[PDB]
Design a protein around this ligand. Structure first.
Ligand SMILES: *[C@@H]1O[C@H](CO)[C@@H](O[C@@H]2O[C@H](CO)[C@@H](O[C@@H]3O[C@H](CO[C@H]4O[C@H](CO[C@@H]5O[C@H](CO)[C@@H](O)[C@H](O)[C@@H]5O)[C@@H](O)[C@@H](O)[C@@H]4O)[C@@H](O)[C@H](O[C@@H]4O[C@H](CO[C@H]5O[C@H](CO)[C@H](O)[C@H](O)[C@H]5O)[C@@H](O)[C@H](O)[C@@H]4O)[C@@H]3O)[C@H](O)[C@H]2NC(C)=O)[C@H](O)[C@H]1NC(C)=O
Ligand SMILES: *[C@@H]1O[C@H](CO)[C@@H](O[C@@H]2O[C@H](CO)[C@@H](O[C@@H]3O[C@H](CO[C@H]4O[C@H](CO[C@@H]5O[C@H](CO)[C@@H](O)[C@H](O)[C@@H]5O)[C@@H](O)[C@@H](O)[C@@H]4O)[C@@H](O)[C@H](O[C@@H]4O[C@H](CO[C@H]5O[C@H](CO)[C@H](O)[C@H](O)[C@H]5O)[C@@H](O)[C@H](O)[C@@H]4O)[C@@H]3O)[C@H](O)[C@H]2NC(C)=O)[C@H](O)[C@H]1NC(C)=O
Ligand SMILES: [Ca+2]
Ligand SMILES: [Ca+2]
Ligand SMILES: [Ca+2]
Ligand SMILES: [Ca+2]
Lengths: 258, 258
């Protein structure tokens, strides 16, 4: 099973309306059984609907989806979009993490949580926790995912959970001496599949912003060793830097389950 | 490997000075490779020293030990005593959990923590967290052991931890609707080996006060199925109720590791 988390810079109407851009997006998505899309700036679901049009153009059930409400604390809002192949996986349950709220809420974009059924893999049931952190508050946010894990355990009684997304987990946003502050890192319950030395950005910076974390021995046993990696689409398609950048400034991060 | 946690009511000088009482205590202890002794009321270590006298009477290295400082918030104090066979196990490290302190500390008797090396078992390294809770504050205390687990993970980077002792985890002290409040119970990270239906008291009450909790798949795989149980010494030796009671009002709880 192939899973990815992809931050598509300003995913929306304007972007999906460009057939050249749309075409590459479809391409990327089709590589996966499950894909988490972030930075969905689409209040009326027009862009999401254009994407599904393309994905299901030949079969109405190529891809199914789960979308959250537009989330954010200030005025700027984004959705979490999960696309999945219904022939591979099934959605058992979903819930939005209740963070509070104002002044008290712990996240700009509280995590969407989805429980999947996967018959082809070792793990038969697992949950994915999505997080697109706020740069400014990266440390606090990643640290709070430890509380989300707990919430999942209390609700579904499941230990098998994959935490993923654009955590802004490197460079200016999470510096060297701040890892101490993050429970999701200091607790050995969790394995970080994308290492600190990985480059998940399409621009010239070298930062491991995008990450994949897993908890659960059944899930941890299901990851194919060395499969977790950012997907450099620029290299893959022989794109120009300006063309790679018009797609996104981030690479998708993927992992394979067996 | 055979491990037990035993609350010996008012373990001290008076008690150890009774050769008939002392004799049974030795008997019980010798059944185990590792034994956690609670309710050690021995400011000057006289009782602890009398017990070691007996245990090592034939070989100076029959049993080794780790003792905490006398702990408590009010005036009443107790030590945590760990006895172990040096030929079976080894102490790698130990520390006293730092709870605060006054007004702020989370435990009457903050947990003593010991990391063991066990060559005969599947798990080669694991930690034991001792807790003799305050009846009055049982719920809060058991709930705080979730924070201790974390502390252990941050310090030793170990997931394999056994949490044990007289938690006062039943009857008046932890009622039916209060289990919700305990993270050590609602988190599926932990397996409770002593069930709620077990009787760990030597008196006429039927309460599972004494418990054994494990976290870590390596440790969880090492427990021998169905070995976790209270040791009814009254039944075992054909003791009178007044004689069983002069030993303790609690049964030891034991488990076997393979
Ligand atoms: C969806 O997504 C993709 C990815 O985002 C999009 O593709 C990108 O698109 C653009 C164009 O929209 C292209 O950008 C460059 O832009 C210039 C624009 O023109 C400049 O110059 C103007 C006048 O200057 C002269 O031009 C010569 C070359 O630029 C110059 O050397 C000469 O001396 C003069 O200066 C002026 O208008 C400006 O303000 C501009 O900065 C493009 O010209 C450049 O490429 C060139 O292309 C033309 C072809 O265009 C002409 O012909 C047809 C038919 O009549 C058109 O109608 C146009 O109206 C015409 O201009 C050639 O004539 C040249 O020889 C020349 O080399 C260049 O394209 C990208 O680089 C491109 N990126 C990728 C990698 O695809 C796309 O926009 C999106 N979708 C849609 C269109 O909406
Ligand atoms: C360490 O631990 C263990 C466990 O804690 C200890 O064992 C327990 O110990 C005691 C005794 O210390 C024993 O308790 C019972 O107590 C009475 C005490 O006497 C009562 O009566 C007195 C006068 O009454 C008469 O007594 C008859 C029987 O009780 C009665 O039926 C008759 O009509 C009268 O009433 C009075 O002093 C009281 O205030 C008392 O309440 C014991 O007698 C009873 O058992 C009996 O034992 C005697 C033997 O004792 C005598 O002989 C030697 C030699 O001279 C002694 O010096 C004593 O001084 C004497 O009294 C018999 O004569 C009887 O026939 C009678 O049945 C009973 O023992 C426990 O039950 C015992 N428990 C166990 C299960 O072992 C031990 O104390 C500890 N270690 C040490 C000693 O310090
Ligand atoms: Ca929020
Ligand atoms: Ca880069
Ligand atoms: Ca204390
Ligand atoms: Ca009982």
């Amino acid at each position: 099973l192939k899973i990815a988390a992809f931050n598509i810079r300003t995913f929306g109407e304007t972007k999906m309306s460009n057939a050249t851009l749309a075409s590459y997006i479809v391409r990327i998505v089709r590589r996966y059984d499950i894909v988490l899309i972030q930075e969905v700036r689409d209040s009326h679901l027009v862009a999401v609907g254009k994407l599904l049009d393309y994905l299901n153009q030949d079969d109405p059930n190529t891809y199914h989806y789960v979308v959250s409400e537009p989330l954010g604390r200030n005025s700027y809002k984004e959705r979490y979009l999960f696309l999945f192949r219904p022939n591979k996986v099934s959605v058992l349950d979903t819930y939005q993490y209740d963070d509070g709220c104002c002044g008290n809420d712990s996240f700009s974009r509280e995590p969407a949580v989805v429980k999947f059924s996967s018959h082809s893999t070792k793990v038969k049931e697992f949950a994915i926790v999505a997080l697109h952190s706020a740069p400014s508050d990266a440390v606090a946010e990643i640290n709070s995912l430890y509380d989300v894990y707990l919430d999942v355990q209390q609700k579904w009684h499941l230990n098998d959970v994959m935490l993923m997304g654009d955590f802004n987990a490197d460079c200016s946003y999470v510096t060297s001496s701040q890892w101490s502050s993050i429970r999701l890192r200091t607790s050995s319950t969790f394995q970080w599949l994308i290492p600190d030395s990985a480059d998940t950005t399409a621009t010239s910076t070298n930062c491991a912003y995008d990450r994949i974390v897993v908890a659960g021995s059944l899930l941890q046993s299901s990851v194919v060793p060395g499969s977790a990696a950012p997907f450099d689409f620029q290299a893959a398609y022989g794109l120009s830097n300006e063309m790679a950048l018009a797609i996104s400034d981030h690479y998708p991060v993927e992992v394979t389950l067996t």
